[PDB]
Write a protein that binds this ligand. Structure first.
Ligand SMILES: [K+]
Ligand SMILES: [Mg+2]
Ligand SMILES: [Mg+2]
Ligand SMILES: [Mg+2]
Ligand SMILES: [Mg+2]
Ligand SMILES: [Mg+2]
Ligand SMILES: [Mg+2]
Ligand SMILES: [Mg+2]
Ligand SMILES: [Mg+2]
Ligand SMILES: [Mg+2]
Ligand SMILES: [Mg+2]
Ligand SMILES: [Mg+2]
Ligand SMILES: [Mg+2]
Lengths: 50, 200, 227, 100, 57, 113, 113
């Protein structure tokens, strides 16, 4: 029941540092209905070019 | 001959060519033609069973393996003689396998089709008190990614549902509906449209 | 928004068009017959044995983003071809004018993508770098293809409305002679002569003269057709 | 969705029940674990010789030019066969078949 | 033969020249042979001739 | 009923049209030029350099049956020709629409029944 | 009177058109495409992609000796061509009617007297 987001279709997510966007993702559409909790499982990975 | 390689009057039209004979399967992979294919198996089945294809081809330094990530669109087209190309299979890649067969680098691609989407989804709503026609609308629109067209639905014995189908795999629910009705065929067309209609 | 047609064919193609040396078109009878069917001055979409525009739109799926192109043929002009000086093997003569390819679509192109709720431009385009590589562009206000192309129509994916240029031949001529002539819109000219009859807009056939304005001077005493 | 041209996102779904779990973060983890353990993976066999001191969990450089492979991989399984003198390395992941 | 746009110098036909709109800039020559170069008399025009109207008699 | 014309020529023909693999047409300049004379949309009898129709009727005998045909060329359409896709030898691609043969009669036909 | 154009080309040409057996035209796509562009009944100068005639007069000096002809193409009919019957290599069938060559000029002809 977070004000701006309940009853809304959610389409995107992003990891942030204050205002600055670190990552951005497109989600499959969902309605955040009344009494539903929403959570993230945001995987950030550090690799080499081999 | 080929254009520009013959002086006029010297050669016969379209020589040395001749009419196509034999069977050819063309494999299309996100719109690209796969050219090194040497065997194709396509299987098309009634609802309890998965529709699938297996494509076998030659690869070089793993260049072709890279073309087929999981969920890649595959289409198989068939022609015999000088018949137009017919799209016989459409599906998505589930397995890409490359192994050595006695020196040869063999790429095998396995693909499943749209019947997986009726199989791996569950009914979410309670259809108690719905007609089979009303239930099909609710289920296909809510619980499956395939398109619903009311004109593809012909229920031969429409009756009210007294069970809440609210956890069943969609395929199992549909089969129960077919059992209650006149033993109808259901599935997903190549149009990506759902149908439910009298047999034969 | 881009779409390859797998069974489309383009003719004719040479080293002097955009193809490599192994990849020049074959010399089919049907290709010569279909190329000879050209009868315009620009790029245009060809007509059947009864004059209907081929490559119709069919089964327009309302707001559901999709449309079907029916089978047919299109003439697409490209400029800048090289030809062979007579009896030389070498391509050496740069042409002064644009010259047509035939593009034959032998089957329906089904469920072409449109962008949602908006105007989309339907361009048919040829890639002159490889033999018979043909594609459709169809997107929101989408820029015309760089490569030899024709506009098969335009579609609004809100209303499902479709309108189309280029659907038959545009044809600059000097002189034309006929049995009958039958236009859809304006029969235009700096002179119209009726040699035996003029039938007017209400379907009344005047055997004799017509009458200009300011005529009343004739109805007066001693005039022709006095009242 | 984009691959097949589906009207809506291409959902493939399982329902699990874990009644003794009271915490939502644990239920999330069970669901995540379920997705992870059957998520698509490279697997498979390289046949070589020797490597008696190699254990699963170890890393090895593998170059197979006809296959376009030139990588450092984790070993999921080793099989030693005398007679044929084979060491079979399973790399990245091991999954069963009917057994699974 | 069928086209969209015929662009010509001269056109000449041995039967009907039909169109759901005929547009004659510059000249019209009728079935008798009079070569008009202005507007034409509508049927039932006579009201124009009456007191103070255009083309009074 | 019959009237076999012994001197007519038809172009273009290959095994994509209805002929055997031996019996393909030759690649003559005069054929290409006469085929380029097509401009209509249906089948039609071709005009001379002035526009006057060729293959005229002549010399009707009336009660004694017979009639004569003058020289000239006709365009006749045919459906379902096969063509060769891309760089291929093989005829594989069916044409969607009907396409012209130029039929050339080089001399008059005398006394058709 | 003759100004000979060193870069002009003519198509199509065979033994049956008049050239020697060593000298027949090669069958370029650009030739086929430009030949197909014919549509009239007689001979004429061809229009561009916009429907405007090519081979224009240019630099028309009022009182000097010389004029320029622009690039472009024209169609010129000739009669009495011979074509190859059936699958015979021999040119044996005389055409009943006149047929177009394409004449193509790739440059402006400079200073024709
Ligand atoms: K039953
Ligand atoms: Mg040739
Ligand atoms: Mg052949
Ligand atoms: Mg099936
Ligand atoms: Mg099935
Ligand atoms: Mg081609
Ligand atoms: Mg070459
Ligand atoms: Mg459709
Ligand atoms: Mg022949
Ligand atoms: Mg007689
Ligand atoms: Mg020449
Ligand atoms: Mg010769
Ligand atoms: Mg000059």
């Amino acid at each position: 029941n977070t004000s701006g987001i309940v009853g809304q279709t959610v389409r995107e997510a992003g990891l942030k540092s204050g205002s600055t966007l670190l990552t951005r993702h497109i989600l499959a559409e969902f309605l955040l209905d009344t009494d539903q909790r929403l959570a993230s499982s945001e995987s950030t990975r550090f690799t080499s070019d081999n | 001959p080929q254009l520009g390689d013959s002086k006029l009057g010297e050669s016969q039209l379209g020589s040395p060519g001749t009419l196509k004979q034999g069977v050819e399967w063309t494999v299309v992979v996100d719109g690209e033609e796969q050219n090194n294919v040497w065997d194709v198996q396509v299987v098309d089945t009634a609802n309890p069973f998965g529709d699938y294809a297996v494509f076998k081809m030659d690869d070089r330094g793993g260049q072709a393996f890279e073309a087929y990530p999981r969920g890649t669109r595959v289409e198989a087209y068939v022609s015999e003689g000088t018949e137009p190309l017919d799209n016989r299979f459409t599906g998505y890649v589930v397995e890409r396998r490359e192994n050595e067969q006695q020196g040869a680098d063999v790429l095998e691609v396995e693909a499943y089709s749209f019947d997986q989407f009726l199989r791996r989804n569950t009914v979410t709503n309670d259809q108690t008190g719905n007609t089979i026609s009303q239930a099909l609308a609710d289920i296909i629109q809510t619980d499956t990614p395939v398109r619903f067209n009311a004109a593809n639905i012909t229920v031969g014995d429409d009756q009210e549902l007294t069970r809440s189908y609210q956890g069943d795999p969609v395929e199992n629910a549909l089969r129960d509906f077919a059992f209650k009705s006149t033993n109808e065929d259901f599935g997903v067309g190549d149009d990506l449209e759902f149908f439910f209609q009298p047999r034969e | 928004a881009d779409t390859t047609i797998i069974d489309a064919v383009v003719f004719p193609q040479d080293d002097g068009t955009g193809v490599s040396n192994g990849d020049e078109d074959y010399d089919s009878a049907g290709y010569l017959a279909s190329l000879a069917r050209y009868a315009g001055d620009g790029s245009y979409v060809g007509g059947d044995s009864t004059g209907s525009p081929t490559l119709q739109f069919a089964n327009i799926d309302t707001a559901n983003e999709e449309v079907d192109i029916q089978p047919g043929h299109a003439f697409i002009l490209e400029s800048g071809h090289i030809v062979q000086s007579g009896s030389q093997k070498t391509y050496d003569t740069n042409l002064p004018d644009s010259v047509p390819y035939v593009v034959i679509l032998p089957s329906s192109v089904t469920n072409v993508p449109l962008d949602t709720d908006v105007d989309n431009d339907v361009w048919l385009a040829v890639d002159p770098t490889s033999n018979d590589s043909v594609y459709i562009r169809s997107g929101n206000g989408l820029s015309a293809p760089s490569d030899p192309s024709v506009k098969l129509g335009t579609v609004n994916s809100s209303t499902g409305s479709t309108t189309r240029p280029n659907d038959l031949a545009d044809h600059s001529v000097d002189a034309l002679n006929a049995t009958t002539i039958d236009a859809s819109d304006t029969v235009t000219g700096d002179t119209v002569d009726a040699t035996t009859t003029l039938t007017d807009a209400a379907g009344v056939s005047h055997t004799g003269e017509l009458e200009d304005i300011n005529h009343g001077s004739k109805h007066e005493d001693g005039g022709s057709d006095e009242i | 969705q984009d691959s097949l041209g589906l009207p809506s996102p291409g959902t493939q779904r399982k329902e699990l029940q874990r009644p003794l779990v009271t915490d939502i973060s644990d239920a999330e983890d069970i669901g995540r674990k379920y997705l992870a353990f059957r998520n698509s993976t490279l697997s498979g066999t390289v046949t070589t010789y020797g490597l008696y001191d190699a254990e699963p969990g170890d890393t090895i450089d593998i170059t197979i030019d006809p296959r376009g492979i030139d990588e450092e991989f984790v070993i999921a399984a080793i099989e030693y066969r005398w007679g044929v003198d084979e060491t079979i390395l399973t790399v990245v992941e091991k999954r069963g078949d009917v057994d699974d």
